[PDB]
Design a protein around this ligand. Structure first.
Ligand code: HEM
Ligand code: HEM
Ligand SMILES: C[C@H](O)[C@H](O)[C@H]1CNc2nc(N)[nH]c(=O)c2N1
Ligand SMILES: C[C@H](O)[C@H](O)[C@H]1CNc2nc(N)[nH]c(=O)c2N1
Ligand SMILES: N=C(CS)NCCC[C@H](N)C(=O)O
Ligand SMILES: N=C(CS)NCCC[C@H](N)C(=O)O
Ligand SMILES: [Zn+2]
Lengths: 411, 407
């Protein structure tokens, strides 16, 4: 069976067969669509099939399907599974794996870059200090003095579920949130709970509005440890506006390197619970969501006040006007300091190209419209008009519970 | 599989039990989400009728009553004997309000119970249809103080006798493709405009020509009729700050009146059922004016504002968009024509979702359609999980009549 998606701006119709390789489930049924729901030990049993399936794809990717090298590999993984109960990926398979997990990530608008990933193999890592060292090299390699390069660092895979590697931070760089006694929040409200744990673990909090959090690192199932990223490795950008000179006086900055650190990377049925990855920012991530979500820094009011907008009625669109200026300011500051960033028009246009290409060359491209459409000016971007099919392919990046919820304290 | 939805801005969690009544299919499976796809006999009729009457009598608290059973009895006899049946007026009104109640794509549903239903099931000709339509237009428009309405033409019988309004909305502007390849007027209506022209209409060929009504009774060939201009309330678009704005020469109409949908009630099909409410500002100011395939006025606006159009990262498109939308809202408000902004409408919808969860055990909602086409994440609906499913009575899409009509 073959499925059509139409783009309603251009009439371009595309044909999807790739969804026929979907194994995992969407969370939807014939009777209910869950397309907008945020989140809808493994033994020998399921393991060889999952391995075989990955290796067939891998050997196909390299035009060696059914080759002796292919057959021997299946044989050896099989024997390793029955004997040791798990198996090790070769370097080539890991790189390919990490690349496909990105390629298959339906909520990522940046996928046109998928094949250029820099994969850092941290599977020889044994301790949290070793983790801190790997992560430092990742931040420095990816930051690259403002000319950002995609990277991922892969820590040892899960074994029995009791020896997990985890990065307890949700991103490698993020600001502290602090709940004040009067009920207000200082810094980023999104990181209040994580901040508290850091504080409890012994972190001395400067208690400002932009304090870079310490790394909280767990190796081998052991209690996690704190480390401070060398500030010289943390590239930040002060926010100003090309016309509003009072904008700088708001005191805003952001970090240049977005580095998701809490997802799980599954390759050939193997689980990499610590696999921090990084690319670079689309401007709206910062200017719309980080700055203007009511539950984040929420600057709309103060920006609007300074613009002397009519704030007495929503239908003045004061909120929308401030939002544009803040996003102009974010992109301008980044470009000025020569730090990599992409605006939402450029990114979404690239995405449509990537997506058409992927349909032609691959048979499709799983895409989550809810997440792909940008959080401002949605319909003036070409993705708004693009029908998408969403489905789950492996290799993949999955959510996992926050470790402070499941971890067993050595104490 | 009683389901939770969470608002991520507020942490309000709501339990959905209403979805366990869903009947029709979504288009999705366990293996594929199709949430962003635009369009994903006697034996059949009685269960359909039963399911509807059961809800009706439940709604007025005479579930299981003699009057309930008697009605079921009666309708059943009438199907057996006549192969269809007729809705009581009360059932028709309930059915229409509920079809709007169930429309998972409509953000305006807080208003659902206030619908004015005009029963046109005694209509027999296109002239009669024109008369009904003008009365609807005039009633709904109400000199700018708009009022919700639907007008319901006779139901399908054998599919060879359908009533249809061929227009997609009662009131829309014409589209003409030019000698130089461009388009004057509304490009979305280029083809309908052709059918009107190749049906007799004399196009003024301007940028904002109100299209004629093309109306079809009892399966006959449809007929043209001009809406009395004095019943078409239009708004000249000016900006409260940019005096040059009015020289753009933009106007829009006050009455949004979708006319190409199919209303199903208790298994009966009403293939002509035009309904109207009033505009959320973005519909005109974002989609109608700025979509690339519609009036596409972004460059000309940004130019008059002297914006840096050299690079997309100046957000000139975005800047222009805010201003256009301020001008739409301002114009309608100045001329006292009902209009709602996207902030105010989405806040209402959240409140309505609240009400429905509490009073009905859920509210079907299609996030893809409910989040406005500008400033999505600064409206509360962006942060709101929604469960989408199909309840009946419903409004359904249907093919365009020209593909179907046997002349
Ligand atoms: C190179 C520049 C990149 C851009 C501009 C980009 C863009 C984005 C954006 C805008 C999102 C939505 C994030 C949000 O709203 O919170 C996202 C999600 C995602 N991206 Fe990327 N991305 C990039 C690189 C990467 C890389 C290197 C990976 C992995 C190797 C990745 C995997 C993902 C995943 C798994 C998600 C889903 C996140 C979630 O479910 O919370 N992306 N991407
Ligand atoms: C009272 C003011 C109303 C507002 C503000 C409103 C708002 C909207 C909006 C913004 C949409 C999406 C439209 C688009 O983007 O093309 C919509 C769709 C819809 N509304 Fe309403 N609505 C209102 C009244 C009504 C009424 C009176 C009915 C029917 C009785 C109705 C039924 C629908 C349906 C079926 C859709 C989806 C139509 C489609 O798929 O094209 N609404 N509504
Ligand atoms: C409830 C809803 O699904 C949730 O707000 C999603 C919507 N789309 C998104 N899109 C992106 N890119 N990032 C997000 O956090 C979200 N949040
Ligand atoms: C491809 C996609 O489904 C299509 O653009 C949709 C998206 N959301 C929408 N939302 C509304 N309110 N109206 C629309 O026409 C659309 N179009
Ligand atoms: N572009 C990327 C690499 S996937 N970022 C991902 C998440 C960053 C988050 N939205 C933030 O705004 O900090
Ligand atoms: N608000 C309504 C009544 S449901 N309109 C809906 C369809 C009109 C279309 N979006 C337009 O912008 O003309
Ligand atoms: Zn779905």
């Amino acid at each position: 069976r073959f499925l059509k998606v139409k783009n309603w701006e251009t009439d371009v119709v595309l044909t999807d067969t790739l969804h026929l390789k979907s194994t995992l489930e969407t969370g939807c049924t014939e009777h209910i669509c869950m397309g907008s729901i945020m989140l809808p030990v493994r033994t020998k049993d399921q393991l060889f099939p999952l391995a075989k399936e990955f290796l067939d794809q891998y050997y196909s990717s390299i035009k060696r399907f059914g080759s002796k090298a292919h057959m021997d590999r299946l044989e050896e993984v099989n024997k390793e599974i029955e004997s040791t109960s798990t198996y090790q990926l070769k370097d080539t398979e890991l790189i390919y794996g990490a690349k496909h997990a990105w390629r298959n990530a339906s909520r990522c608008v940046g996928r046109i870059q998928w094949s250029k990933l820099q994969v850092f193999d941290a599977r020889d890592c044994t301790t949290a200090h070793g983790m801190f060292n790997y992560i430092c090299n990742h931040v420095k390699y990816a930051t690259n003095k403002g000319n950002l390069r995609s990277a991922i660092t892969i820590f040892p895979q899960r074994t029995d579920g009791k020896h997990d590697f985890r990065v307890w931070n949700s991103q490698l760089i993020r600001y502290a949130g602090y709940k004040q006694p009067d009920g207000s929040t200082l810094g980023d409200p999104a990181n209040v709970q994580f901040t508290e744990i850091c504080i409890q673990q012994g972190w001395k909090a400067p208690r400002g509005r932009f304090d870079v959090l310490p790394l909280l690192l767990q190796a081998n199932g052991n209690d996690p440890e704190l480390f401070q990223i060398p500030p010289e490795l943390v590239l930040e950008v002060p926010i100003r506006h090309p016309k509003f000179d009072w904008f700088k006086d708001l005191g805003l900055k952001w970090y240049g390197l977005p580095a998701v650190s809490n997802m799980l990377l599954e390759i050939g049925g193997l689980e990499f619970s610590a696999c921090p990855f990084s690319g670079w920012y689309m401007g709206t991530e910062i200017g719309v969501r980080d700055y203007c979500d009511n539950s984040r820094y929420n600057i709309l009011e103060e920006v609007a006040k300074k613009m002397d907008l009519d704030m007495r009625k929503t239908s003045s669109l004061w909120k929308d006007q401030a939002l544009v200026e803040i996003n102009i300011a974010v992109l301008y500051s980044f470009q000025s300091d020569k730090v990599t960033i992409v605006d939402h028009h450029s990114a979404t246009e690239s995405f449509i190209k990537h997506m058409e290409n992927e349909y032609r060359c691959r048979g499709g491209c799983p895409a989550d419209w809810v997440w792909i459409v940008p959080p401002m000016s949605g319909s003036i971007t070409p993705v708004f008009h693009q029908e998408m099919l969403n489905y789950r392919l492996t290799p993949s990046f999955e959510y996992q519970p926050d470790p402070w919820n499941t971890h067993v304290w050595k104490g």
